[PDB]
Each structure stands twice: as structure tokens, then as C-alpha cells.
Design a protein around this ligand. Structure first.
Ligand SMILES: Nc1nc2c(ncn2[C@@H]2O[C@H](COP(=O)(O)OP(=O)(O)OP(=O)(O)O)[C@@H](O)[C@H]2O)c(=O)[nH]1
Ligand SMILES: Nc1nc2c(ncn2[C@@H]2O[C@H](COP(=O)(O)OP(=O)(O)OP(=O)(O)O)[C@@H](O)[C@H]2O)c(=O)[nH]1
Ligand SMILES: Nc1nc2c(ncn2[C@@H]2O[C@H](COP(=O)(O)OP(=O)(O)OP(=O)(O)O)[C@@H](O)[C@H]2O)c(=O)[nH]1
Ligand SMILES: Nc1nc2c(ncn2[C@@H]2O[C@H](COP(=O)(O)OP(=O)(O)OP(=O)(O)O)[C@@H](O)[C@H]2O)c(=O)[nH]1
Ligand SMILES: Nc1nc2c(ncn2[C@@H]2O[C@H](COP(=O)(O)OP(=O)(O)OP(=O)(O)O)[C@@H](O)[C@H]2O)c(=O)[nH]1
Ligand SMILES: Nc1nc2c(ncn2[C@@H]2O[C@H](COP(=O)(O)OP(=O)(O)OP(=O)(O)O)[C@@H](O)[C@H]2O)c(=O)[nH]1
Ligand SMILES: Nc1nc2c(ncn2[C@@H]2O[C@H](COP(=O)(O)OP(=O)(O)OP(=O)(O)O)[C@@H](O)[C@H]2O)c(=O)[nH]1
Ligand SMILES: Nc1nc2c(ncn2[C@@H]2O[C@H](COP(=O)(O)OP(=O)(O)OP(=O)(O)O)[C@@H](O)[C@H]2O)c(=O)[nH]1
Lengths: 221, 221, 221, 221, 221, 221, 221, 221
């Protein structure tokens, strides 16, 4: 009727663990269209406060572009209606070893300064009853990435979403990323990168499994 | 009394050529403090429109951090009071060959989506009466970079600022950058990068000089 | 009233362990202004003893620049009034795995010859009650780096400062650096680099954790 | 009787062109020993002004080490008594093509902040009557490098020193370097590097020769 | 009165273990000057046996250059009068983790063909009562390197010298090198390299420590 | 009857141009066996002068090994009886473009200190009446390399040897090498390398051809 | 009826230019089967002369494998019945710029020692009336590669075959290769590689075109 | 009287373990000269069967070249009269850690198709009573490599040869190689490589030692 069974499931799971992004229920039944126009209005004000000449052919549409970007693009992960369609195939192949999807492109936004987070994620899991379609892992990652994030939370969320959908605790997520709110300003450290990992099931319990995954993490380009 | 002779000079030069960032004069004598609080207010609204729980310990101060960032950090280049102190040494060494400062760290913001532009600039010039202090070239670049930009304009601005301060038309600026408003969203092209160059004096006239510079452009890390 | 609670805490911790930089209390209430002028005075003398023509437009301001650099820049870490503002977010995400910030830019000065130490630090910790703001790790590193150091001590200082602020002994710091007082003169070894690591809590006790961190240390560029 | 014919020649050549380092004649007949003790005295004062505990076993000898380093090591290039012994072999091989010595290690000090300059020089020349001993090129570069420099002047000096000794104007010098007074502090640009070149004779006249040299410049490691 | 305490100690240690370089006591009180002239005499003979025209301006001084090189340069490690001055600082920092100096430039000569051995050493130790000055490790390595060697012995010597000076058995040395008497002639293997390691104390006893070191060995450039 | 026509031709060509290695005719009809024993005798003396214990199982045969190495191996290039067998095939393929053999392994000895020179040569020529067998270029380079050399002369000798054998002046030779008598001792420059080139015929006349060759010079590994 | 029109054309073209592989007409109407058995017979003999135990399970079938390999595989290019099927599409796209197929895998055999030649070819041409199917270029290269070759001839053959088929003289071929009969034995040069190029039409006439191609040659992996 | 004690020992050891190359005793007392002429005869026939014009100046001597190559070069390993001279030095240095010679050039021939095998071997051993001369390891590898091989057997032979000569079972050999009979033809896999390892003594027993060696295996260039 709105949210898919999966979307609902993942959402509840996150809420239960207290890992959901801080959200207040939709204050009023607003069309994304009205929300965008309102956001655009505020951007117009802010741009004017910065003394930008909004009459300039280029600058003129920026409040619109920004409103659209926030609502439809970069923060679309906040709406579970945008949760990807998950397809799982029966594990007839009897795969009992981990499947690793490495170097998943991940672009997020830091909630602290609303500045770009560019990184790559490495997800691995040991198939139980079903094998998830490869692209879905990338889609789920991008879903949670499209929200004002805190890398530490993002990793946790991805882990739970997967554990929930795959029906196994044997999931591990590692994210390596560069925060422009560290690089582009403030301390302006042009070289540092942050790495966060959340291990589930055997990936935490079994040191054998755990290290196999960790060893596999990080691959240049 | 406010702007240094240099700042004034550069500003006028840009205005004269019509290369200045679209700015409307300070509407009213507002303290950066009041501007920030106003910007913060609008951010609070926008964040609320996105349904973010502003009561969350982390999210709570984001409108403040963003306001400060815009005014004091990332868009500080809009205020010529922030123009760097230029120091020039007499060209007693009789340098008659170009001096090239390569891989200058450059972090800017696209004016179209207010999203990160990460790149590197290569500046070169042929000393006439004076030799500019090396760090000043980096400072000037970062100055113009700290504004809502359009790479094509940024390059031009840097070129003119330098030509003005050095007293020679023999200046060349090349900027190679990645736009997150292309990578992180929209067409999401993870590999493309844009390169823009503005050549002045001999760097445009003399094919010999011109190519020497172009050959020198781009160096990994 | 002067030093923040954090600054005070870290300082005391260091003193208690005997890991503080050898300092004599401020002999007399001198303005940094008077200290600088005196330092510059001594530099003038030194430069004269080297037979440098201080009347040269360029050389003329060096004593001033050096005084300023020592007091305000490169040795600012000696004054806890310059300790960074630490911000910690409650560990609601329930992160129980280490967070690693790698390739933190680190530029320090050797106390033995007052010559450049260029390196990179890798800090990792396992969140307990709170998660520290990423940039703060970078800031703290740079703080202790801005002092006449001994790499062996620098590593220890950073370790303790973090353990103190984070409220966990599970912190690990590794610094890889090139000493110009080895490279640029003396034995003039153009290739060697020194690596020092200080491990705390699980990073030292648990060989599993220990090796996970060590394995993660060092990343080119 | 003191300076070698070569040292005298080079010194004069530099003075004639006005390219010598700004030096005041030795004010008084001071032993390097007394100069050092005086320099060490001033360092003791400076360190005390920084509140350093000079009673510390390590810190205790730093003023001595710094005095020795300035006089005997890093600034030894200021004394032509330290000029290298040049050996030239008769060009019987009838070499008429350029000889290029690339990636010559070069460590110098910036005269503006007395901070490290780490770089590499590439020198090339076309043999006329004599061929210089390969290591001598390295020794001459290091000689002029061991002085408070300005890259633009350093390049020039090396060019003239060589033109003088070789008896040909066909000499070219290029230096690519990283200034720690740009990287380690101030604007703290961790990625930029400066490249300066001084071309003599055919290397400037003949575009054919000129480009062959420029093409040959820069080689990683 | 001649050899420093350290030199004497190191020498005795080696002799005791039977790891000293095969040396016969100074047959007669010969000045290095007379030794050099005699060596040069023999070289003159050898060069004449090779039919070289010693009247050639270049060739003429080779016997002198070789004699000086053998006695003063490449084989200077044979005279303990040339042992480096060691400086140790009290381990007040309470460093209990290994300090690793990697990629120490090492150039030696094979005793079998008196041909170049070019390589890099990696030394690591766990501080006990004192911390050695970083450059001293490089100096000790170069000292023993300056002798007609056998890589297997060289590694051993360095290990003992350091254990002796540091007062700890917890020292490890690894040397990776290319032998020109394998590359430049004979089997002419242009790609092979030899790696020898000597482990002491915990580096041998504790597999945990041992592997941490071994893992750390070898770094390109 | 002794020397092949080729050996004789090349030798004469070199002598005519004054590019031969400085050699005195074989003083007396000595067997290489007697020369070797004599050389070994001198090495025994030199080693004794260095206080080496020649009774050591290892050191015991070094004089012999060195004698053999000099006479049979590293300086075998001095005897034209060791000139390679040249094979040329008729240029029926009508090749009128240059053939380039790049990265030819080259190991030589500096005549100034009898120390290793390790480098790589790049030879190219435009076939006229005949095409030389590829390995022969390598063999000729190694021949001349096996002599106490001066890079500048080595390059010239190879050029002439080839022009002579190929019957064309259209030959170009470039050698890039590292001198251990610069690296391993003296100024100890661990990074510099010297490049020398000798161009003949069109490679010197035609800037088109000249630059095509130069462009092709140098290839990593 | 046997050879395709293309095959016949190419063959005749080569014969006309005198660039065909030295072949004597099929002495007698022998089945490849009888030829193979005879070749295998001779190999059996050769292996027995080498004292190999042909009764060994593995060795037993080598003569058969070699015969099949020579006739059917590595020397199949000797039979024009094996010439690839060429497909050309009408140049309706009006392509007037060169099409470059780079890094074409090329494995051939030297006619001098019947040893492996492993390399890569780069072919470029300017479309006139028709555009050739991309894979056809690879197929033609491999065809001529499958014969006992001389790199100088191979390059020529490929050039002509393509000029013939494409109906344009504007074709250029460059082959970079390693000869195991230089590497694996004889002089055993483990690093050298040979590059041969044959330019036709504008690639030879127009220096503009010529250099665009040459610049494009060679790409790692 | 013919074979050295070592050659005899190694040969017997191999035969005893059943690891010798399948050889039939020398059928008749044939001079290598007669074997070569006979081999050449067969090659003449084979070449004629391939329709090659043996009257061609180039092709004319291939039968001879191949015969010489097989007998003297590439298959010389089959004659123990070609076994290298082994020199061992008494392990007075008391080396008790493994010595590893890595990246030993290895060129062999596959016995199945008589096609090139190009690879690199890594040998390591723990000295017992004696230390083998470094080049001897290279020489032994090349010896066994110069035979029609099967990588799996080659590795074993080298292992045994070494264990025998060194008087210890603590030897490990690993070979990584590319088979042109897989690359150049058949399945034509241009990227695969095969790695085979044979471990002896502690390298097999002790997992500690075993993994230290394995970890050390493979180094690019
Ligand atoms: N743990 C964590 N911290 C983050 C993340 N994104 C940003 N931060 C940090 O959260 C903190 C925000 O701190 P504040 O002190 O409130 O803001 P600020 O002073 O403008 O930040 P800085 O100038 O960069 O130190 C900073 O230390 C940020 O770098 C993230 O994903 N995870
Ligand atoms: N042209 C040139 N400039 C140099 C060199 N070394 C340092 N400089 C610059 O010379 C100038 C010194 O400027 P000042 O403004 O007097 O000192 P400063 O303010 O401490 O310098 P910054 O904080 O780095 O901008 C700076 O721009 C230095 O980076 C050099 O070799 N060549
Ligand atoms: N020339 C130029 N274009 C830029 C720069 N920064 C952004 N742009 C582009 O300016 C345009 C904005 O176009 P709009 O069509 O108005 O906005 P948009 O549709 O949201 O943009 P896309 O979804 O990325 O195509 C886009 O094509 C941007 O990628 C810049 O520095 N220079
Ligand atoms: N352990 C340690 N030693 C350092 C550090 N920085 C410098 N050193 C060394 O501390 C020692 C100073 O030794 P001294 O002998 O007192 O001075 P010096 O003789 O001028 O030093 P060298 O000429 O470089 O050997 C040297 O070995 C320095 O390289 C550091 O961070 N840690
Ligand atoms: N273990 C060891 N061997 C070395 C070292 N330097 C040289 N060697 C070897 O010691 C041996 C000398 O052997 P000899 O047979 O006496 O001399 P050689 O025949 O001229 O040597 P090759 O022709 O290279 O095999 C050779 O195997 C050298 O490569 C070293 O540092 N360690
Ligand atoms: N041009 C040239 N010079 C060479 C070559 N090999 C060595 N040399 C140099 O020839 C010169 C010999 O100089 P001397 O001054 O006679 O000997 P030296 O003082 O021991 O040499 P250094 O200590 O290295 O400066 C040195 O500059 C050597 O580095 C070569 O191939 N070509
Ligand atoms: N020009 C050319 N020469 C080749 C080619 N393949 C092999 N050769 C060379 O042709 C020559 C054969 O020379 P020969 O002297 O007849 O045989 P060889 O003595 O066994 O050869 P080497 O021992 O390698 O010098 C050698 O110089 C080979 O390296 C090729 O494609 N082109
Ligand atoms: N294990 C092993 N196999 C090898 C080696 N060299 C070659 N081979 C393989 O031994 C087998 C020979 O197989 P055959 O089927 O008798 O000959 P073939 O059909 O011509 O071989 P392909 O066409 O390459 O599959 C092939 O699979 C070869 O690739 C080696 O060193 N070790």
C-alpha cells in the first residue's frame, strides 16, 4: 500500500535497535513539491544573506536545484518509499562460504556540516537460505548513504538492513571514507581517511572468519 | 582603513573585466553574527522540513555549524577583508624564466548545487620586476576558491588577481577538478574530471612558452 | 577561566605519567608580544653572526617571521590555551568495533636540532560511552605535533590525551615519520623512516585486536 | 692561500651578476668556535623564552647542536673555504651532446623562516673544452643549497657556478622542491611543489635544445 | 685514549661471539698514509698488467683514488677509531613498544669479489632503560657496512652491536640487498635479491613480536 | 688469425676518432694465467695492508677471484679477441624506419674508482643495406661496458662500433646510469642518475628523427 | 576454390614487394597428417639424441604434440587457407581521422632459434572508402605472427596486408616485443625489448600525422 | 674424473627419490658434435616439411643454431658435467634464521611442447653447518631449469639438490611461472600464471616457519 514488506522490516529493525536516523514524523501532509518550494525559499534567503546576486542567469536557479537535490537526490534515503526492490534467489547452489562485494561506490553527506563524504564500502555475508542479488547490496548501501550521516551509524544501519533481509547474522560491513568537512575546511587534513567496520555473526565470533574478511578489506581503485 | 591596497586593486580589476562573483552590495550593515544567526534559522527550518529530529544531541548544532561554515569558512572569499597579505621581493636574481607552483590544493563549492569541488591548480608566471612569495600563490588560489564558483570563472579570477599583483600579463593558471555535483549525484559519473586553463601574455602568444607550461601541467599526488 | 576542562585533564594526565614536554613555568608574566620581540632579537644576532646582510629587503624580516613562527605556529602546542575544542557524541549507535583514522598529516620539529619531522599518524580506538568527532583526532595530533618533540614521546602523548578524553584505554597510535635531522644533514640517509607505535587496552592485551590494528597501519598517499 | 682558484672565480662571477647571497664581510676575526658558542648562547635564551626545561638531559645540548648545525652543516655553503674541489677531464671523447645529471638530492633552508626545503635538481650541459667530474655537479648543488636560500636565486647561482667552471654558457638547471614553510605551517598546503629553471646558452636560444632538456626534467624517485 | 667505551665494548662483544671480521693485528705501525701509498703502488701495477695507459690524464690518479677509497672510505668500518659517537636518552617516556627504523640506506662490498652490495636495512628494538638517538642506528649500520662483508655476518654484527649498546636482547635486524657480484657478472641474475634477518630476544622468542617485525619488513623506496 | 674483420674494423675506427680506451700495447707476451697470478699477488698484498686475515676460509680465495674477475669478466672488453660474432641479414624487408632496442642491461666499472656503474642503454638505428641481429646490439654494448669506463666515452664507442658495423651513420645511443662512486661513497647521492646520448646521422641532423628517438628514450623496468 | 580473394591479394602484394616469408612450393601433395607424422618422427629422433626416456608417460606424446603445434598452431600463418575472413563496412560515418587499435596481443616465433617472441602491436589507419571490423586487425596480426619470423619483416607484412585490404596507404604498424632467444639464453638480457615500426602514407609523409601516431604508441598492460 | 662429488651426490639423491628427469643412458659414445649435426639434420628436414626456403641467408643456419641451443644451451641441465661448482663457507656467523634469495630469474622449457616457461624462483633455507655462496643458489636453479621440465618436478629437484648440498632438510622453494604453451597457443590465456612450492624440514613442520616463508614469497620486478 506504500512501503514494501522489506522496507517496513528494515525500518522496524533499525528502530528496535535504536539505529534509525533521527526523524520526527511528517509534521503535516506536505507534497514534496511544497517542501521543495519552502526549502528553495529559505535557500533564496540564505543566498541573499551571502550577498549573492540572485538575478544572475546561473545563480537564479540554485535555490531550486538545491531544494530538488535535498529532497529527491542526496537525502532521498530518508523516505522508505525509496527503498530498493530486493530480489533473493534460493540458495540451491549450497553456498556456505562468504560472498564479498568490494569497492561499492558510496557518496554520503555528513549531518554535522552537510558536506560531502566520499568513500567505498565492502560488504560480505555467508549465504544461509537465500542468496541476494548482487546489485541489491550496492542499492541498499546507496540508500542509507543518501541521508545526513555519521559514518559510525551508516555502517551499523547497512549491517542490520542486510542481516534482516538475508535472514542471517553473518554479515560484515566496512566503510573507508574521506570527509570533506575535515579535508575541505576546519583542520583541512588533505590525507586522512576514516575506516569503520561492523561485524555480525561469525564475522565477530569466529576469529578465523573475522580475519578472512578484514584481510579482504580495501582495494585501490 | 579596511581593504588593503592589493585587495582593492584585485577587486577593481575583476569588476572592470566583469569577472567578479555576482554580488549585491551589503543590503544592510549586518554583523556577521546576525547574518549567521539568520542563516542558522533558515537551516533549522530546512532541517525540520526534511523531518530531522533537531533535538538529537548531534543534529542540534548543525544549523549553527553550517551558518559558521558558510560565513567564516567556505564562502569567506566573498569578503575582500579576507584577502591575503601579499609580499613581493625585488627580482634582483634577474629571473627571466617561469616559476611554476604545481599541485596547489584547491577545494571550492559549485554555485549551481552548493556541492564540493575538489581539485588542484597549477600556476606559473614569468617574473618581471618582482617575485611573489610562493605561499601567496596558494593563498590567492584558496581565496577565490572559497566562494560559490564555476570552474571557468575561478580560473579567470585567479589569472587576473595574479596579473594585477605581479604587474605582468605573463601568468597562466590551470585547474583540474572533480565536481561532486556530477559524481555524487545526477549522472553520477565516478571517473570524469574537468580541466580549465586561462593563459595570459606569452603563455598565450608564444607557442613555445605556451606548450612549456601545458607540458608541465598535471602531476599525480 | 583560561584552560578548558579537557585541556586541564589531558595536561594533568600527561604530568602524572611523566609524559609531558619538559617545561619550566612561565618565568615571568610576559606577553607573547614581548617574548616574540626578544626571540627576534636573538635571531637578529644569530643571523649577524652568520654574516647575513640583514639590510636585504628579504632577510630584513626573517627574525620577526621566525619569532612569530616559533611562538604562534610550530610550537603553539606548548600552550594549552591552544588545545582544541573537543566534541563527543553519545555512542547511541552502539559501535563496539574500532574506528580508525589513517594518514593523519603530521608535521613536527625535532627537539634535538629544531629541524622538520614530516610524517603521518594512524589512530584507532574502540568507542565506549562516546564517539569523538573525527576532526578532533586530527586536531589533537597536530596539537602535540606543534612542539619540539621526540617521536617516541609524541606517540605516547597522543595516546594518553585520547585515552583521557574518550574514557577508554582502548586506543592505539602509530606514527611513521621522516626526520630531516637525519635526511638533510649528518648521516644524510635519504631513504629511512621511523615508525613508533603505542598501544593501549585491548590493542595491547588482545593479540587479535592488536594485529587487526597493526595490519591496518600504513597506506601510501 | 685560502680559497681555491675555482672558489674565487665562482664567487666573483656571482658578485658581478649580483647573484650572491646577501652577506656582510666578517665583522671581526671570530673563530667558528666563538661564533658557535655565541649562537648557542642565543639559542639557550630563545629556548628559555619558550619555557623549555633546559635541564632535561635531551634538551640540554640542543643549543650546542643547533650552533654546530648552522655553522658547520646547513649553512656551510656561506663559506667558500667549503667550496668543492673541482676536477675536469679534457673532452677528448669529443662529446657534443648534453650530459644530464638528474634527480640530484637537494636539501636547503628557506631564508624567510629558516625552514626546510627538500627537493631535487636536474642539471645538464653541453661539453666544450672539458667534461666535469659527475660528482662535482652534485657537490656544487649541495654547496649552494647549504645556505638560507630563495629557490629562484639558488637555481641562478648553480647555473652561473657551472657556466664559470665549465667555460660554456650552455648549462641548464631546474629544481623542483617542497617548502616546509608552506607545507608544515601557514597555509599548510600538503600537495604543492615549486619548480624553477634557469637556462643558459643554447638551452635558452635553441628551442630544439631547450625542449630536449625540459622534456628530460622530472623523474619519480 | 683512542677507542671510545662503546667502540671497545662492541668490538669485544663481536670477538666473544666470534662474529668479528677476519682481521690480523696491525702488522707494523704504518701510517694510513704509507698504507695508502703501498696500496696505490699495487694498483698501479695491476692497472699496468691490464695494459691501461696510466699516462692518461684521467687514469693517472686512479691508484691514488682507489687507495684513499679503500682506507678512508669503503673499508673505514675496519677501524674502530671510526665507530660513531653514540648518544642515548633516558627512557623517561616509558616506551615499551618497538621502535622501527626502516629503509636504512646500506652500501657495502662483498669480501669474495670486492664488488658492490647495495641494499636497505630495517632495524627494530624494544626500549629498556634507554632510547638510542635515531641517526645512531643508521650510523652503526653504515659503520659495519663499510667493510669487506658477507651479508650473513653483517646482519649478525649489527644485531650484536645494538644489543650491546642498548642493553637489551630485544633487537632485530633485516637486510635486503642486491649483490653486483651476482648481477654484474658470473650468473648475471639481474632480478634476484637476498634477504637475511637476525632476531634477538622477544623478536625470536615471542611469535607475536617476531611476526609484527617481519610483517613490517620491506617498503618500496 | 686472431681478431675478426669486424673486431679489427671497430678497433681501428675508434683509434682513428681518438675514442679508444687508453691502452698501452701488451708490454710482454704474458699468458692471461701469468697476468692473473700477478694481479692476485698484488691483491694479496693490498688485503694484507687492510689487515684482513687471509687465512680465513672465505677471504683466502678472494685474490684469485678478483684476478679472474678483472681479466676474464669485468674488463674482458679490453681484449678484442672477445669481440662478439656479428651476424647481419640483408635488408630485403626494405626497412626504412628506425629499429630501437631499449632497456639493454648495462653494467660497467668507473675508471676513476673502479666502482660499479649500473645502467640501461637504448640503441636505435635506421637500416641501410643490412639489418643486424638483435642480440648483437646487446652484445656490443656489454663488450664496451666490460672496461674501466667514463660514461661519456662509452656512449661514443658504442655509437662508432655500430655505425662501422652497420655501414650507416644513422645510429643513436643513449645510456642512463647510476654510479656507485657517487652513491655508495663520496657525496653519497642516493637518487641521482646520469644520462648521456650520442647521436649520429639523421638522429642529429633531422630534428624530426632526433626527437622521435629522444621521445622513445627511458622506460621503467 | 581454396584461398579467398583477400588471401590471394595479400599474398600477391607481399610477393610483389618481396616481403613474403621464404617458402618453397609444396614439394609434394602431402596431407598435413603425413607432414605431421614425419615431423613427429624427426622429433622422436631428436628427443632420443637428447637421451630422453620416451617411454615416460608424459614424454611419450611430445613428438606428436610438437608436430601438431608446428603445423596446426604456431606456424599456421604459413598457409593462406588460414587467412582470416575480412569484413569491411562502408565508411558512411565519414571517418577521416585515424582509428588506432592498441596493445594487440602478439605471440610469434623467431626463425633464427625457433624460440618465443612475446609482444604487443599497435595498428592505426585513416579510413578511406571502408572501415575494417576491429577484430580483423587482431586476426591479421596473429596470422602473420604465426610463422617463423624476424620482427622487422613481420611489421612490414602486417603493414602491407592492411594497406591492401583497406585500399589506403595510410596505415602504420608498431610492434614492441621481447625475444626469448635474447632473454632465455645467449646474452640473457632480462630487460631489453625491441620496437619496430613501419609507416605508410600520411603516417610517413605528414610529420603531424606521424607524430600523433608515434605519441600514441605503447601503453602498459 | 668427470662429475664432481656434488654433481654425483645430487644426481643419486634425485634418482633415489625418483625425481630425476626421464633419461635413457647415452645410447652410444657420441660427441656432442655428432649429436648436434644429427639434430641439425632433423631440423633441416622438419623445416623443409614446413616449406621453408632454407636457401634464405637467414633461415640457412637455423638448423645449426637450434642444434647448438638444445645441446649447449637450453637443455644443458641434462648433463651433470655442467653442474655448477659449489662453494660453502663454514657457518661461523652462527646464522640460525632463514636466508631467502628471492626473484631468481628462471627460464625453462615445457617437456610437453618444448615451449618457453618464464618465471621466478624464491629459495630460502636455515643454515646448519654451512652457508652456501649466494650465486650458487641461482646457478643450481638455472641448471635444473635448463631441461625439458614440468614445473611440479622442477621445484622438487631444486629442493632436493639444495637439501643434499646444504646438509639440512630445512629448505623451501617456490616457483611462479608463465607457460607459453598456455599463453601463446592452445587456450591462449594471456593472464594466468602457475605457482608451485615444495617445502622441506621446518618449512613444512613448523607452521610458524612455513608461513614466514610463504609470506615472503612473490615480489614484483
Ligand atoms: N564520529 C564522527 N564525527 C564526525 C562525522 N562527521 C563529522 N564529524 C565530526 O563531528 C564534529 C563536529 O564538531 P563541532 O565541534 O560540533 O563542529 P566544528 O568545530 O565546526 O568542527 P571542526 O572545525 O571540523 O573541528 C567534528 O569533530 C566533525 O569532524 C562522522 O561521520 N563521524
Ligand atoms: N619566491 C619565493 N618565496 C619564498 C621562498 N621561500 C619562502 N617564500 C615566501 O616568501 C614569503 C614570506 O612572506 P611573509 O608574508 O613575509 O611571511 P609569512 O606571512 O610568515 O608567510 P605566510 O604565512 O607563509 O604566507 C612567503 O610568501 C613565503 O612562503 C622561496 O624560495 N621563493
Ligand atoms: N560549466 C560549468 N558547469 C557547472 C559547474 N558546476 C556545475 N555545473 C553544471 O551546471 C549545470 C546545472 O544545470 P541544471 O540543469 O540547471 O541543474 P541539474 O539538472 O540539477 O544538473 P544535472 O542533474 O547534474 O545535469 C549542470 O549541467 C552542472 O553539472 C561549473 O563549475 N562549470
Ligand atoms: N630517539 C630519537 N632520537 C632522535 C629524535 N630526533 C632526533 N634524534 C636523534 O637524537 C640524537 C642527537 O644526537 P647528538 O649526538 O646529541 O647530536 P648530533 O651528533 O649532532 O646528531 P647526528 O649528527 O645526527 O648523529 C641523534 O642521534 C638524532 O638523530 C627522535 O624523535 N627520537
Ligand atoms: N653467502 C654469501 N655468499 C656470498 C656473498 N657474497 C658473495 N657470495 C658468494 O660466495 C661465492 C664465491 O664463490 P667462488 O666459487 O669462490 O667464486 P666464483 O666462482 O667466482 O663465484 P660465481 O662465479 O659468482 O659463482 C659465490 O657463490 C658468491 O656469489 C655473501 O654475502 N654471502
Ligand atoms: N664525467 C664523468 N665523471 C665521472 C665518471 N665516473 C666518475 N666520475 C667523476 O670523476 C671525478 C673523479 O674526481 P677526483 O676528484 O679525481 O676523485 P674523488 O675526489 O675521490 O671524487 P669525489 O669524492 O666523488 O668527488 C669525480 O667527480 C667522479 O664522480 C664518468 O663516467 N663520467
Ligand atoms: N634483426 C633481428 N634479429 C633477430 C631476430 N630474432 C633473432 N635475431 C638475431 O639474429 C641473430 C642470430 O645470430 P647467430 O649469430 O646466427 O646465432 P647465435 O650466435 O646463436 O645468436 P646469439 O648467441 O644470441 O648472439 C642473433 O643476433 C639473434 O638475436 C629478429 O626478429 N630480428
Ligand atoms: N602440470 C603441468 N602441466 C603442464 C606443464 N607444462 C605443460 N602442461 C600441460 O600438460 C598438458 C599436455 O596436454 P595434451 O592434452 O597432452 O596436449 P595439448 O592438447 O596440445 O594441450 P592443450 O592444447 O594446451 O590443452 C597440457 O594440459 C599442458 O598445458 C607443467 O609444467 N606442469
Amino acid at each position: 500500500p506504500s512501503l514494501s514488506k522489506e522496507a517496513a522490516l528494515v525500518h522496524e529493525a533499525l528502530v528496535a535497535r535504536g539505529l534509525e536516523t533521527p526523524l520526527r514524523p511528517p509534521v503535516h501532509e506536505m507534497d514534496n513539491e511544497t517542501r521543495k518550494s519552502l526549502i528553495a525559499g529559505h535557500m533564496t534567503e540564505i543566498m541573499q544573506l551571502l550577498n549573492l546576486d540572485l538575478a544572475d542567469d546561473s545563480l537564479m536557479e540554485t535555490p531550486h536545484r538545491i531544494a530538488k537535490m535535498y529532497v529527491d537526490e542526496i537525502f532521498s534515503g530518508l523516505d522508505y518509499a525509496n527503498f530498493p526492490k530486493i530480489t533473493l534467489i534460493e540458495n540451491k547452489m549450497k553456498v556456505d562460504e562468504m560472498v564479498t562485494v568490494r569497492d561499492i561506490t558510496l557518496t554520503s553527506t555528513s549531518e554535522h556540516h552537510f558536506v560531502t563524504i566520499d568513500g567505498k564500502a565492502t560488504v560480505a555475508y555467508i549465504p544461509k537460505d537465500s542468496v541476494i542479488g548482487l546489485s541489491k547490496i550496492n542499492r541498499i548501501v546507496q540508500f542509507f548513504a543518501q541521508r545526513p550521516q555519521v559514518q559510525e551509524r551508516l555502517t551499523q544501519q547497512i549491517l542490520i538492513a542486510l542481516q534482516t533481509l538475508l535472514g542471517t547474522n553473518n554479515v560484515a560491513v566496512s566503510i573507508d571514507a574521506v570527509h570533506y568537512c575535515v579535508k575541505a575546511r576546519g583542520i583541512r587534513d588533505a590525507t586522512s581517511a576514516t575506516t569503520t567496520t561492523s561485524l555480525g555473526g561469525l564475522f565477530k565470533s569466529s576469529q578465523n572468519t573475522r580475519h578472512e574478511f578484514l584481510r579482504a578489506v580495501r582495494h585501490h581503485n
